[PDB]
Write a protein that binds this DNA or RNA. Structure first.
Lengths: 122, 197, 127, 111, 106, 167
RNA sequence: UUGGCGGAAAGGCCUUGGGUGCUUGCUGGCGAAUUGCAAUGUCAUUUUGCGUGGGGAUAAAUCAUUUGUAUACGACUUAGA
RNA sequence: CCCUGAAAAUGGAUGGCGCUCAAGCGUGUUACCUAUACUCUACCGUCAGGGUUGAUAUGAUGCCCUGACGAGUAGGCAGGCGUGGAGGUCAGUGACGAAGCCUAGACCGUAAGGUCGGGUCGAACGGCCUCUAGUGCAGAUCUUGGUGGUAGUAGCAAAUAU
RNA sequence: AAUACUGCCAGCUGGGACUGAGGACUGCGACGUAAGUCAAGGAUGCUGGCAAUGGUUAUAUGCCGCCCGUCUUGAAACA
RNA sequence: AAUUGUUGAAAGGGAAGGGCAUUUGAUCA
């Protein structure tokens, strides 16, 4: 959602040219972040390795309002409330156990060929 | 057969050479064309100059930067000729075009390689004796090309170097022929002659 | 355990979809003949979808035949399963979706006892 | 149409290869003399060779012999029509028109 | 021996097609060294193989081959018609295939 | 019942196939295929290697030899469609090939479940091969360059057209 | 390893001396199989990361403030350890 | 044959590239490519000509044999799928899960449609032979409800000023 | 005399592609003095490999493909 | 369902969407 918005040099670090400085959304996100941090502290997760692994913003039911236009016409003037959710997680990913054996099927000619290579090579 | 085929542009009709090279590229053979400034077109110099002026007249009215790009170099003229022959819009045509490499003169990575001529696209073999032809280099330098002297000097230097190389090769070939003649008149030679080789 | 039958061939393995089904959401994926005066599908031009025709049928010998060579029969109880006692070579039982597991296990046991193939053996069963 | 005088060899080849009869308003192939005798024995014709003879030499029962035979459905010529435009006269360089004895080659190519 | 080849090089030109309609079921193969149908009527019934490579092993090897046979001659330039068990992906209009010498009658 | 009843059930009685008038006849080999002929194999492990035709087995595969002191192909059976018969021929008179037959090369079909997921030759077979190749080289040595010819392997070079090559 | 030539895209070529193999130019010996009548029957190259040894040095840009030869915002042009 | 006659407005048409003992023009001869065209074969449907109560054995509206054909607006006829209800039957299914919904999962039927596997879910539902209709949507500037591009855009600039 | 051209062979033969429908016998024919056999009212024998072929969907490639319904002789229309 | 946000997969030189056949990726008896 950056149609017909102004450009700035503060967004150059992200590679984009059009960026803004929202206020209400930033305060709401910061409040929910502090709530998540408090929840993690209460649960027992240290804040050293906590990273925001999920976030989601959906549209809430609209609060209908009214506006007045020319020639005695009534138009649509509601809001767009947000449903915000977020999940922070402790980061821990060193290595896995890979896949299974993945047994291959060998033709008789293929088996003879590998036997020949084994017999010939040291 | 050869992975890359080098074709000289001397005395070669532009249309016939373009058709042959386009067919080969569509078949899947890598082709590099050298000395494209010596290509010859049937008709007189004034005829081809008028044709090129007619081509130049065509341009987009509202924005001339989006109109037909009338390239002036002989190599670019040859490339445009082949592009008018190959369907460049399709991916297969694009691949055929990237298979092409057209240069003016004899590049450094191609001076020391064998050059091949097209017997069915040569002016001396197709045009009637006494018919008027033109030179692509002269047409380009009269239309707006500005690098006629540079390529001429480079070609002269390359010709001198190749003449020295051919003198050395001819000496070596004479020595090899003398060695073969001495090796002849032997039993192996008679058996080879009887068996053909 | 199938009777010797000719190899099953299908003249049209694809699904006949209605025109503009992928263009408009109101148009479902159910075939409807185009009755428009200028409909390209109805006029059968080149490069458009193919209307179903009488020629796209299947051989009556290999019609209604599953790839395993057994006709599909829907069963709901042990008494229904007893119908295919002397016809297990051509017909295969199929438990409907409304039968609970307590009857499904009995139906499967009876089918195994009588040598009747079931097209859905792993249905509503513990993993 | 293209029409011409046929020969015995091409008549025999046509009758042998694409020879079909008309029995009970059906195109039953002729692979035995029994069917020909059953459907044409009243006219003295009882074998495929007799039918070919009646075709080549016009006789008392040529009308019935020809009516018994289904029209021969030939294919396109194997070696081509030999002309660039079929819809021109034979003297004008096409397949349209009388071909006289030249019809034998075209018939055998198409058969 | 520096060369170990038991086949004949061929180039996949295109399918048996027309001005605006093409038939993927039949392809056209050009044989190097053949210029007329008189000598093209020697590689008839021979097996053509397209030998391509993928990045995933199927049954121990990453090289997969598509097989077909020569059916008849196409044109006066030595091009022949080919019928494959699976039609070529049409991305190989100019690729190199191997025409084997079997079944050999000579 | 979800489905009421099939009105008529097909009878589950198999029908015998009709009598077929398709007899078998012996294979008619090509005129260029005659015992003692030098052959080049096109497909298989020993492709390109040159071999000698000895006997026509009843199963429509030619008995062929790769005499072991020349190139190492064993006494085997080869299909008629995977061999090119060269012009040169070395006779095989005095070489007994009556012992070799179809049941000589017994497959002994491998076991089903136990596949070679990981990890031989008969002394009788070695003995028959030695007996054959002794006389084979004894006759072959009478003419020059045949041993080296058969030891070398056939290959196709650039500019070689099989339709114009008289193998 | 010594030297020379090549700038158009040189990025390659020639050459000097030694070492490491082969040599089918000719004459011998040894083994080739149980891969079963064909089933590409691999050995070439285009990138990314990983692991092992030798080798080369420890930098800039943007935002922030400000300048004005610049401008709607961008952007341009400057400066301040 | 060619040339003057022969001049119209965005930049362009033998399609263009291009072609000159032509790849231009007239004529003569072969080879080559293809239409849902022609010949044969496999399958489906329709029509016509027939056989088949000497059976346990049922569907003679069933089965099989032979031949021919298969385009199509308005329109007619015929054969079939599905929806809301009622009668007979399945002594039908189901709280250990009925209906509904979701499901680039599977099967059958050329097709309308049917069926299975999994998740959600919570009290009803289905097959067979018939009767009945308020029985099938893609449009009618269709009636109602909700939702998108525009769009975080126009704009929130009269009335002296914080 | 030979040869060119045309037409005939119920003369022979080499190579390649598609198709395998029907399912105990019924008929028309040939070989064989005779048993019996056959290319004679629709393909069988042997052998090899695997227990990958193939179905659905996404992308890619070669070709084709104008927007649904109505009015109209004429629709995709700048109706 | 229209619409919207994240995760997972694919494509994107002035459109997307479809048909004829296949390669590759995912999945399937």
């Amino acid at each position: 959602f950056n149609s017909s918005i102004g450009r700035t040099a503060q967004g150059k670090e992200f590679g984009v040219t059009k960026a803004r400085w929202p206020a209400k959304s930033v305060k709401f996100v910061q409040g929910l972040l502090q709530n998540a941090a408090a929840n993690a502290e209460a649960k027992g997760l240290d804040a050293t390795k906590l990273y925001v692994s999920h976030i989601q913003v959906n549209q809430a039911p609209k609060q209908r309002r009214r506006t007045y236009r020319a020639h005695g016409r009534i138009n649509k003037y509601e809001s767009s409330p947000s449903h915000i959710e977020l999940v922070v997680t402790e980061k821990e990913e060193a290595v896995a156990k890979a896949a299974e054996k993945k047994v291959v099927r060998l033709t008789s000619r293929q088996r003879g060929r590998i036997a020949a290579q084994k017999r010939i090579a040291a | 057969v050869e992975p890359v085929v080098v074709i000289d542009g001397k005395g070669h009709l532009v249309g016939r050479l373009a058709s042959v090279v386009a067919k080969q590229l569509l078949n899947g053979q890598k082709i590099v064309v050298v000395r494209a400034e010596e290509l010859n077109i049937s008709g007189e110099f004034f005829r081809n100059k008028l044709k090129y002026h007619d081509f130049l007249r065509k341009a987009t009215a509202f924005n001339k930067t989006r109109g037909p790009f009338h390239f002036r170099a002989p190599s670019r003229i040859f490339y445009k000729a082949l592009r008018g022959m190959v369907s460049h819009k399709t991916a297969r045509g694009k691949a055929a075009l990237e298979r092409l490499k057209v240069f003016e003169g004899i590049p450094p990575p191609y001076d020391k390689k064998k050059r091949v001529v097209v017997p069915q696209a040569l002016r001396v073999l197709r045009l009637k004796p006494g018919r008027k032809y033109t030179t692509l280099g002269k047409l380009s330098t009269s239309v707006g090309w500005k690098y006629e002297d540079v390529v001429a000097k480079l070609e002269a230097k390359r010709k001198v170097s190749s003449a020295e190389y051919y003198a050395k090769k001819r000496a070596f070939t004479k020595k090899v022929a003398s060695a073969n003649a001495t090796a002849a008149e032997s039993d192996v030679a008679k058996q080879l002659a009887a068996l053909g080789y | 355990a199938s009777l010797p039958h000719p190899k099953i061939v299908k003249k049209h393995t694809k699904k006949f979809k209605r025109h503009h089904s992928d263009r408009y959401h109101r148009v479902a994926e159910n075939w409807r003949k185009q009755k428009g005066i200028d409909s390209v599908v109805r006029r059968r031009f080149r490069g458009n979808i193919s209307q179903p025709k009488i020629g796209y049928g299947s051989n009556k010998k290999t019609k209604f035949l599953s790839p395993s060579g057994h006709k599909t029969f829907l069963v709901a109880n042990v008494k229904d399963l007893e119908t295919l006692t002397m016809h297990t070579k051509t017909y295969a039982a199929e438990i409907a979706h409304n039968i609970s597991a307590k009857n499904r296990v009995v139906i499967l046991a009876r089918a195994k006892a009588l040598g009747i193939k079931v097209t859905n053996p792993k249905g509503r069963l513990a993993l | 149409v293209a029409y011409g005088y046929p020969s015995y060899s091409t008549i025999r080849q046509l009758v042998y290869k694409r020879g079909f009869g008309k029995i009970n308003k059906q195109r039953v192939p002729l692979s035995d003399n029994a069917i020909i005798e059953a459907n044409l024995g009243k006219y003295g014709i009882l074998s495929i060779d007799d039918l070919i003879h009646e075709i080549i030499t016009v006789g008392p029962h040529f009308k019935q012999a020809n009516n018994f035979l289904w029209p021969f459905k030939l294919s396109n010529p194997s070696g081509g029509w030999g002309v660039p435009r079929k819809f021109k006269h034979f003297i004008q360089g096409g397949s349209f028109g009388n071909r006289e004895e030249f019809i034998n080659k075209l018939v055998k190519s198409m058969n | 021996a520096e060369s170990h080849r038991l086949y004949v090089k061929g180039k996949h030109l295109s399918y048996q097609r027309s001005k605006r309609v093409n038939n993927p079921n039949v392809s056209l193969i050009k044989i190097e060294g053949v210029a007329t149908p008189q000598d093209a009527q020697f590689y008839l019934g021979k097996r053509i193989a397209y030998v391509y490579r993928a990045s995933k092993e199927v049954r121990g090897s990453k090289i997969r081959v598509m097989w077909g046979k020569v059916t008849r001659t196409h044109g006066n330039s030595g091009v022949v018609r080919a019928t494959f068990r699976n039609n070529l992906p049409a991305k190989t209009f100019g690729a190199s295939v191997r025409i084997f010498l079997y079944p050999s009658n000579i | 019942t979800a489905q009421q009843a099939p009105k008529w059930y097909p009878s589950e009685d198999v029908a015998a196939p009709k009598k077929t008038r398709k007899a078998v006849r012996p294979q008619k080999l090509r005129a260029s295929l005659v015992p003692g002929t030098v052959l080049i194999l096109l497909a298989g492990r020993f492709r390109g290697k040159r071999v000698v035709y000895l006997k026509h087995l009843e199963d429509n595969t030619l008995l062929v030899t790769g005499p072991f002191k020349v190139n190492g192909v064993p006494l085997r059976r080869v299909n008629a469609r995977y061999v090119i018969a060269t012009s040169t021929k070395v006779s095989v008179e005095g070489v007994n090939v009556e012992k070799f037959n179809v049941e000589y090369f017994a497959k002994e079909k491998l076991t089903k479940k136990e596949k070679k997921e990981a990890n031989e030759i008969k002394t009788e077979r070695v003995e028959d091969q030695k007996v054959v190749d002794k006389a084979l080289l004894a006759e072959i040595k009478k003419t020059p360059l045949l041993k080296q010819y058969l030891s070398a392997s056939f290959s196709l070079k650039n500019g070689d057209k099989p339709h114009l090559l008289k193998f």
